[PDB]
Design a protein around this ligand. Sequence first.
Ligand code: GRG
Ligand code: GRG
Lengths: 359, 347
Amino acid sequence: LAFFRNMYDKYRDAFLSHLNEYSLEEEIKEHISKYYKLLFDYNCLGGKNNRGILVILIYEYVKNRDINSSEWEKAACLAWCIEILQAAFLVADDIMDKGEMRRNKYCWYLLKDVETKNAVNDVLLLYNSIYKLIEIYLRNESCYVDVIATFRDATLKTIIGQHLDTNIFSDKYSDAHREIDVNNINVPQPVIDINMINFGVYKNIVIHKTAYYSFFLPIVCGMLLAGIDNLIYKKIEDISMLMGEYFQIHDDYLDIFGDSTKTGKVSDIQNNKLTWPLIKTFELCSEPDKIKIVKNYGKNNLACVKVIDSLYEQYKIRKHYESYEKAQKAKILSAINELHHEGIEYVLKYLLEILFTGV
Amino acid sequence: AFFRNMYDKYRDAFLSHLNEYSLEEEIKEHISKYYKLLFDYNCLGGKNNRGILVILIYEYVKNRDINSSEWEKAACLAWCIEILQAAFLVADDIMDKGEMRRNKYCWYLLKDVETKNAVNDVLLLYNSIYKLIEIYLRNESCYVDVIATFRDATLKTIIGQHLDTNIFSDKYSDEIDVNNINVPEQPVIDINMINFGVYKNIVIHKTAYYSFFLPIVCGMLLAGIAVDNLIYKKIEDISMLMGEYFQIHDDYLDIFSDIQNNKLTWPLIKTFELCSEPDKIKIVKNYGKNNLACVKVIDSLYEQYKIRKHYESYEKAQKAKILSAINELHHEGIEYVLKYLLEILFT
Ligand SMILES: CC(C)=CCC/C(C)=C/CC/C(C)=C/CCC(C)=CCOP(=O)(O)OP(=O)(O)O
Ligand SMILES: CC(C)=CCCC(C)=CCC/C(C)=C/CC/C(C)=C/COP(=O)(O)OP(=O)(O)O
């Protein structure tokens, strides 16, 4: 954990050293290293590092065995690669959702020395840096191809979850009969589609957007590098899905019922997002309140968000979350005990306890 | 060249992969509708020089019989570079706030798309390449080397793109202010960066590697020419010369949005080396401005210093320099392709 955090610079400078080998004039090289050192530092440092720590712990507990410094160097590489992946996702998400704060600092894209134009380019650099690092440190491992495929496949699932989260209430999803007009370049007003306000659709989004890169990818990383393919991978796939759902519902809860100075970020109601509080309120509310939701949800105006916010207090959404949290935490524990692997079971139970705080 | 008929197979091969995801049937139909248009709109319509370059290099190295299955792997790599070009095109238009590309509206401008989807779509298109390389080349021995060639060429392009975006920025003039989100920096020219050395650094990284090196290395790797072969460095040097040649022509075409977008172009560097001191101040005062009078002034200086004639002089001198480097290859098959590519480049 403290070891993992200390290995950071080794991986950052290994990648910066690779760019430094490029055939460029010495002055250009120094500007590049100044820019990219800050890109990594600013966006890779500051989170709970749950995904990174999950690799390290799964690598150690897959089997009780001797692990040399060189083997740990490969494990802390994969651990930092998932943090770089989280860093790329967060920069991209903030551009896309027009974010203000992340990890108690300004969104990288808002910086006037950066802007959207560099941030778009920087998402791809951070994303490609992962595969450069896995090559530098795992080039000769037999799990190499399987590890790169795991990153590639989790990323693809996240891109699809991101697409669904962005477009679930869009005109092209509500008007399936009409093709996308490639001649219309006017601005779209976003409104909810009640046919999509259901937990079935929610799970489809949340599993793809969070479960695969936050839980499946780090666990499979630790296991592939340890040397294990086996029927346990499907069992860990199912647990990852349940943990992803659990993690995202809490993230939704935090968005409306959390302090920005504690979470590090200020938007779901204004951004017209399909959230768990929205689905819960909709199943529990009266017909006039349903129409009141449709009229005020997805609007940048503070008086419209207050209407939604007041309705969340009215239908005591915080208490329903508390009841969901206990029902799901218990459900995941049950699935973990059906694993029949004491090592992984220990890590997953520990991860489940430390999820919302980190460490 | 049956490469155009193979498009749908690679498109559907990737779409079929997404279709295997655990999603409700209605969600699957919306996804396939969206992503079929994303591929079609951005992968079809270009000259396909990069795609064709793979096919031609593959054919003229393997001077022997090539079966349908071997061509299926070659046209996969060829379409992968076209998907890469598609991902670059979409990203570039978001970044440069483009209006038109290949005689149609930029994908990000579309009402049903917007910048938010366009950012996400660049990464889908980009990752679809590696899914396709896996589907069709996972059992080839060149597999790892091919993926490494795509990764390394992309990394170089990202760096050239960074340089092209920031070469005149206040951060490149002499630390980045992580507290400034409110004071927008006005775009301005930096005369210390108006030189051919800096320009070659940008152009080689931004174009040469993915436009020439990557497609040639793809054909060669798939044909079976070993990575340890000294010819790869020779092809690297030719790719750099061809990249420079291709980009200078692209800059020439733009004028005869770069002026308004404050870009370091070959006509700007040429005009600056050839013009008087009052005209240098006139360039600094009018370049990089979204005002019609300002662009008109820069346009007139390019006409005055007959930049079109200097390009014509450059194009003849550079063409010879590459032909000379191509003849030092000692490979009749590749040499024919490179000479043919050089003739057909602009059309
Ligand atoms: C890594 C990714 C996908 C990206 C983000 C940012 C980067 C590095 C971007 C793109 C910069 C780039 C290489 C740009 C644009 C050049 C372009 C689209 C084209 C012109 O090529 P032609 O061959 O003349 O056009 P056709 O394809 O239409 O024939
Ligand atoms: C392929 C790439 C890089 C991207 C483009 C677009 C995609 C797929 C998206 C990103 C959307 C996404 C999954 C989001 C962000 C989630 C996020 C930053 C959040 C919260 O996780 P925590 O674990 O709470 O944060 P810490 O890492 O700070 O602990």
